[PDB]
Amino acid sequence: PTYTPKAGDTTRSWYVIDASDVVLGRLASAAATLLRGKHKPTFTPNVDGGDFVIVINADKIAVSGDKLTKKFAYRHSGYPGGLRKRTIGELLEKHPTRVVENAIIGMLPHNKLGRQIQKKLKVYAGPDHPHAAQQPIPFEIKQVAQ
Amino acid sequence: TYAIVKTGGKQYKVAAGDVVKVEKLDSEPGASVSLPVALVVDGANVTSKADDLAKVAVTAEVLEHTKGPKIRIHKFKNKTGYHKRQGHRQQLTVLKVTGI
Amino acid sequence: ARVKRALNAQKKRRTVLKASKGYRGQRSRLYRKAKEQQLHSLTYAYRDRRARKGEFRKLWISRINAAARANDITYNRLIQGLKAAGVEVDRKNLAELAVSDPAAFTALVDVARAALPEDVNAPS
Amino acid sequence: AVPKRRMSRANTRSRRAQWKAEAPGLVTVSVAGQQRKVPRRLLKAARLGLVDLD
Amino acid sequence: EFPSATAKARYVRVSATKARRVIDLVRGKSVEEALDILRWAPQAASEPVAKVIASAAANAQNNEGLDPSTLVVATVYADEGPTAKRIRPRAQGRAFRIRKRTSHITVIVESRPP
RNA sequence: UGCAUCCGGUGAAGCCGCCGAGUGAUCGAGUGGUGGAGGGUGUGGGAGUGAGAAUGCAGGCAUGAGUAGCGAUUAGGCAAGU
RNA sequence: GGGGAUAAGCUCCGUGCGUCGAGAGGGAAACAGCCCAGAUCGCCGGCUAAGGCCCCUAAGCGUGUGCUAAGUGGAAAAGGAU
RNA sequence: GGAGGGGAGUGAAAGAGUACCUGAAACCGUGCGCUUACAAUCCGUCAGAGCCCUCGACGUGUCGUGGGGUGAUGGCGUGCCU
Ligand SMILES: [Mg+2]
Ligand SMILES: [Mg+2]
Ligand SMILES: [Mg+2]
Ligand SMILES: [Mg+2]
Ligand SMILES: [Mg+2]
Ligand SMILES: [Mg+2]
Ligand SMILES: [Mg+2]
Ligand SMILES: [Mg+2]
Ligand SMILES: [Mg+2]
Ligand SMILES: [Mg+2]
Ligand SMILES: [Mg+2]
Ligand SMILES: [Mg+2]
Ligand SMILES: [Mg+2]
Ligand SMILES: [Mg+2]
Ligand SMILES: [Mg+2]
Ligand SMILES: [Mg+2]
Ligand SMILES: [Mg+2]
Ligand SMILES: [Mg+2]
Ligand SMILES: [Mg+2]
Ligand SMILES: [Mg+2]
Ligand SMILES: [Mg+2]
Ligand SMILES: [Mg+2]
Ligand SMILES: [Mg+2]
Ligand SMILES: [Mg+2]
Ligand SMILES: [Mg+2]
Ligand SMILES: [Mg+2]
Ligand SMILES: [Mg+2]
Ligand SMILES: [Mg+2]
Ligand SMILES: [Mg+2]
Ligand SMILES: [Mg+2]
Ligand SMILES: [Mg+2]
Ligand SMILES: [Mg+2]
Ligand SMILES: [Mg+2]
Ligand SMILES: [Mg+2]
Ligand SMILES: [Mg+2]
Ligand SMILES: [Mg+2]
Ligand SMILES: [Mg+2]
Ligand SMILES: [Mg+2]
Ligand SMILES: [Mg+2]
Ligand SMILES: [Mg+2]
Ligand SMILES: [Mg+2]
């Protein structure tokens, strides 16, 4: 019998990650890995082992190429011809957090356990957060050289 | 103090005084058996190299022989009139590790 | 000698119902349609009785990768070094250790790294 | 039209689950020396002493 | 465990669901409120149920001799009984078969000290 | 059906559970509760011998559902009585 | 290869062709017929084929050398272009 | 009001009361334990926490070659016969 994690025995932790001048894709991938908890060696798909990750200053996120005017986030309200058209520039101008939020919702397991994990992520626009009472630990994403 | 015993093509982490379920192996219940080792741990120090793995010994005594629980088999191919059934019950041996 | 067909039929009726015990709605009530899902559920039993080994090995590998990265090494390198050192422990025990004794996992990863040759890009 | 199938036991009973009766709170009136039970619908007539209560 | 007296009316001429509708209003209440709700609940099913509860209270008082004011409906339920079956003509000559339902009424009242 | 002949009102068959065993159809001198009169080891023998389907047959009960309808164009209210 | 227009998931032949039919498994999302490969049963063991190794999803966000600015990659021609 | 019913008695038995041996399954209830009101679907199987109850070594709950009931959540998953 292998190991499966208990209900409350699982442990969380808080990290804050600035997004200034960070590549959107790489930041999203690292955030999703940490969110699901794959870094932890207690990972078990049925029960999340992730950590509350808080993203700060999300308006300065950067993307490669000329995407800044040719990325096309989509959605449809629900009625015929209710298709909605938007670009990264407009999205950042009007509601920034949505960019990273959509990026990571795409990565998370689209089942409901993933819909839940989605909760434990929070993204802000400016370099400040009312979550200062949880002592988040700065977490700069790095690669294992090889 | 837990060790890894390579038996029945498997390996298990077992502590002294523990009891394990391993495949059937010809031996009268109540006798004793010795096995090569794949890893031994005592607090901090760890023995891992295959040489020490094969040089140390694990001793345990067989408790009883067990036939597992019924497991049914049901092959079937829709729309083609193939209907195949068969039961199976594997025999297992239970060990109570003694010392390392 | 006409044989009245009562007991025989009821025996198998009840046996199938019992084997179906605990299914949804009428599906544990109507024999004519319990059979459907007795047969199905057992087909799934047959298939997943092997699917389970694949899934569990997947989970073990994932845990091992997590542990190696937390110990600053990639799972494939851990496996390569471990083999090159000629260890005979498998990934089930690897995972159980990695979640039970991080110290032993650290020792094992040091063994793997040390057994790791100098140059990894050597054509030889 | 018609149904395509049987609606599950659970579905029928769920639809039924909100069709039930309700019980009100009664009222007593002290008239003629007796206290009888009348919904406040009747309270003034009860006091006056003409309401046909057995 | 408290002394339970039971009283039921079988083959009584009403639909099971239509009796259960009334019955749900009284389950678990004390006999006083049971009587009040039954009498002031204008449902034809009420009359049979009120009859049965009165009979049960009388049964408990007479056979067992327990104070009515201490009685609360322990359990109550209605089970479909045998159904009279009739044929009723319908247009284009085709005959459709009427299922005249009938349900039993069981009401057992127990004693619960204040 | 044949049999050495036995099982049983100290509870047969049947019904509903539980346990264990066979690779299967199952089995249990295996039992718990109802039932209150017959079953039958073994070895043969003979079969109206094994049901999910056939818009099958007969019986019972489902759902649409407490829904549609309550069968005209004349129509009632009230007093008092049972 | 014939026919069709070198169109059809078209039709008609040959294949000591292959597969499905009468074949479960993995890959191409899904997909019998395309790719890998033959399911006696069980094992919470290991090595591999095709296909893959950033996340959904297991595996290098690998090594070194070059190309691309087109999201080409991730549907297409005649032709045109410092 | 009767129908109907509960006592008392008959009887071995009235869960044998004339709708009367046995009373099964569909079917409809009561109660009990558990699940469920951010959840997209041949309704299960593989994992699987929690809660409920059960049992033995061991104190107030922890272990133990533990069980049954439930099943939060996730992997796979397109009924059957023709
Ligand atoms: Mg066939
Ligand atoms: Mg279930
Ligand atoms: Mg009334
Ligand atoms: Mg007897
Ligand atoms: Mg008996
Ligand atoms: Mg008996
Ligand atoms: Mg009897
Ligand atoms: Mg007989
Ligand atoms: Mg014979
Ligand atoms: Mg014979
Ligand atoms: Mg026949
Ligand atoms: Mg039949
Ligand atoms: Mg058939
Ligand atoms: Mg039929
Ligand atoms: Mg209907
Ligand atoms: Mg209407
Ligand atoms: Mg109407
Ligand atoms: Mg008329
Ligand atoms: Mg050709
Ligand atoms: Mg053709
Ligand atoms: Mg073949
Ligand atoms: Mg195939
Ligand atoms: Mg596939
Ligand atoms: Mg084979
Ligand atoms: Mg998926
Ligand atoms: Mg992965
Ligand atoms: Mg590579
Ligand atoms: Mg690199
Ligand atoms: Mg280069
Ligand atoms: Mg393209
Ligand atoms: Mg082009
Ligand atoms: Mg040119
Ligand atoms: Mg007597
Ligand atoms: Mg009858
Ligand atoms: Mg009888
Ligand atoms: Mg529930
Ligand atoms: Mg909820
Ligand atoms: Mg979905
Ligand atoms: Mg489904
Ligand atoms: Mg699935
Ligand atoms: Mg699916």
CA torsion sign for E66, E71, E73, E75 is negative
Phi, psi of D38, deg, nearest 5: -145, 130
Name the DSSP class of B16: T
What is d(CA A18, CA A36) in angstroms, rounded to the nearest whole number?
19
- CA distances (Å), origin A115, targets A39, A51, A99, B53, C59: 20, 15, 17, 46, 21
Helix or strand (DSSP H, E) at C119: none
What is d(CA C95, CA C59) in angstroms, rounded to the nearest whole number?
9
Q: Is C26 on the interface with D (CB under 8 A)?
A: yes
Cβ–Cβ contacts within 10 Å for residue C32, how many?
Answer: 6
What is d(CA C107, CA B52) in angstroms, rounded to the nearest whole number?
15
Search chain A and give the residue with CA nearest C76: A146
In degrees, rounded to 5, the angle at the alpha carbon of residue A22 between the alpha carbons of residues A16 and A23 is 125
Q: Is B76 on the interface with C (CB under 8 A)?
A: yes
Name the DSSP class of E47: H
Torsion angle (degrees, nearest 10) of CA E38, E39, E43, E46: 50
3-class DSSP state of C67? helix
Residues A144 and A135 sit within 8 Å (Cβ to Cβ): no
Torsion angle (degrees, nearest 10) of CA A19, A20, A23, A28: 10
The alpha carbon of B35 is separated from its chain's Cα centroid by a whole number of angstroms, namely 12
CA of residue E84 to ligand 18 center, whole Å: 23
On the CB side of C97, how many CA atoms lie within 13 Å of its CA? Answer: 28
The single residue listed with the structure tokens 């000698």 is C1
What is d(CA A63, CA A85) in angstroms, rounded to the nearest whole number?
19
Resolution in A, one decimal?
Answer: 2.5
Cβ D10–C26 below 8 Å, yes or no? no
Is any atom of strand H within 7 angstroms of residue C49's beta carbon? yes
Torsion angle (degrees, nearest 10) of CA C52, C53, C56, C58: -110
Residues A144 and C69 sit within 8 Å (Cβ to Cβ): yes
Search chain C and give the residue with CA nearest A2: C96
Cβ–Cβ contacts within 10 Å for residue D53, how many?
Answer: 11
What is d(CA C50, CA C77) in angstroms, rounded to the nearest whole number?
28
Q: Is E24 on the interface with D (CB under 8 A)?
A: yes
On the CB side of A3, how many CA atoms lie within 13 Å of its CA? Answer: 20
Residues E102 and E11 sit within 8 Å (Cβ to Cβ): yes
3-state secondary structure chain A: CCCCCCCCCCCCCEEEEECCCCEHHHHHHHHHHHHHCCCCCCCECCECCCCEEEEECHHHCECCHHHHHCCEEEEECCCCCCEEEEEHHHHHHHCCHHHHHHHHHHHCCCCHHHHHHHHHEEECCCCCCCCHHHCCEECCCCCCCC
On the CB side of E18, how many CA atoms lie within 13 Å of its CA? Answer: 14
Is any atom of strand H within 7 angstroms of residue E27's beta carbon? yes
Is any atom of strand H within 7 angstroms of residue E108's beta carbon? no
| Nearest Cα residue to A54 out of A104, A115, A118, A120 | A120
Torsion angle (degrees, nearest 10) of CA B27, B33, B34, B35: 50
Residues A3 and A123 sit within 8 Å (Cβ to Cβ): no
Cβ–Cβ contacts within 10 Å for residue C59, how many?
Answer: 19
What is d(CA C78, CA D44) in angstroms, rounded to the nearest whole number?
91
Contacts of D46 (CB under 8 A, 6+ apart): D27, D29, D31, D36, D38, D53
Is any atom of strand H within 7 angstroms of residue B66's beta carbon? yes
What is d(CA C65, CA C81) in angstroms, rounded to the nearest whole number?
14
Could you tell me which residues are beta bridge partners of residue B62?
A: B95
Helix or strand (DSSP H, E) at B35: strand B32-35
Cβ C96–A2 below 8 Å, yes or no? yes
Is any atom of strand G within 7 angstroms of residue A81's beta carbon? no
Take residue A86 and report the two structure tokens written for it. Answer: 């938007």
What is d(CA C11, CA A77) in angstroms, rounded to the nearest whole number?
58
Mutate to test the interface with D, among E40, E46, E49 (most CBs of D within 10 A): E40
Name the DSSP class of D40: G
What is d(CA A39, CA C70) in angstroms, rounded to the nearest whole number?
7
What is d(CA A40, CA A13) in angstroms, rounded to the nearest whole number?
11
Residue C23 burial (C-beta neighbours within 10 Å; 0-12, 13-18, 19+): middle
> Could you tell me the distance in Å between the CA of residue C40 and the C1' of nucleotide H79?
8
| Cα end-to-end distance, chain C, whole Å | 85
Take residue B6 and report the two structure tokens written for it. Answer: 């390579």
Technique of determination? cryo-EM
Residues of D in contact with C26 (CB under 8 A): 8-9
Torsion angle (degrees, nearest 10) of CA C87, C92, C94, C96: -150
| Nearest Cα residue to C63 out of C89, C112, C97 | C97
Question: What residue type is assigned to position E29 of the chain?
Answer: K
What is d(CA E3, CA E71) in angstroms, rounded to the nearest whole number?
10
Residues of A in contact with C67 (CB under 8 A): 41
- CA distances (Å), origin E5, targets A12, C21, E1, E56: 59, 36, 12, 7
Residues A42 and A10 sit within 8 Å (Cβ to Cβ): yes
> Could you tell me the distance in Å between the CA of residue E46 and the C1' of nucleotide F52?
45
What is d(CA E75, CA E4) in angstroms, rounded to the nearest whole number?
10
What is d(CA E100, CA E81) in angstroms, rounded to the nearest whole number?
11
What is d(CA A38, CA A104) in angstroms, rounded to the nearest whole number?
15
DSSP symbols for C4-36? --SHHHHHHHHHHHHHHTT-SGGGGT-HHHHHH
Residues E53 and E35 sit within 8 Å (Cβ to Cβ): yes
3-class DSSP state of B68? coil
Cβ–Cβ contacts within 10 Å for residue D20, how many?
Answer: 11
> Could you tell me the distance in Å between the CA of residue A98 and the C1' of nucleotide G67?
36
